[PDB]
Amino acid sequence: KWYFRVYYRGIYYRRYR
């Protein structure tokens, strides 16, 4: 559930390193 959609969790978009 990163941003505007916030309905999942796991995209790993802001999990760099």
Q: What distance in Å separates the CA atoms of residue 5 and residue 13, rounded to the nearest whole number?
A: 13
What are the Cα distances from residue 13, in Å, to 1, 4? 11, 13
Q: How far is CA 16 from the centre of its chain?
A: 11
User: Are the beta carbons of 7 and 1 closer than 8 angstroms?
Assistant: yes
Which bin fits 16, alpha (ψ -120 to 50), beta or left (φ > 0)? beta
In angstroms, the CA 6 to CA 17 distance is 22
Point out residues after which the chain has a gap (C–N over 2.5 Å): none
Are the C-beta atoms of 2 and 14 separated by less than 8 Å?
yes
CA 6 to chain centroid: 8
